[PDB]
Amino acid sequence: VCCGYKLCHPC
C-alpha cells in the first residue's frame, strides 16, 4: 500500500 490502497494521492 501507499496512501489508502496502492495509490500515491497526497494525504
mmCIF file of C-alpha atoms in Angstrom:
data_model
loop_
_atom_site.group_PDB
_atom_site.id
_atom_site.type_symbol
_atom_site.label_atom_id
_atom_site.label_comp_id
_atom_site.label_asym_id
_atom_site.label_seq_id
_atom_site.Cartn_x
_atom_site.Cartn_y
_atom_site.Cartn_z
ATOM 1 C CA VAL A 1 0.000 0.000 0.000
ATOM 2 C CA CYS A 2 0.911 3.767 -0.437
ATOM 3 C CA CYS A 3 -1.986 6.006 0.913
ATOM 4 C CA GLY A 4 -5.312 4.032 1.425
ATOM 5 C CA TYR A 5 -4.641 1.165 -1.053
ATOM 6 C CA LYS A 6 -1.619 1.080 -3.615
ATOM 7 C CA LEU A 7 -2.293 4.760 -4.691
ATOM 8 C CA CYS A 8 0.146 7.744 -4.088
ATOM 9 C CA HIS A 9 -2.543 10.523 -3.830
ATOM 10 C CA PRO A 10 -1.084 13.099 -1.187
ATOM 11 C CA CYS A 11 -2.801 12.599 2.245
#
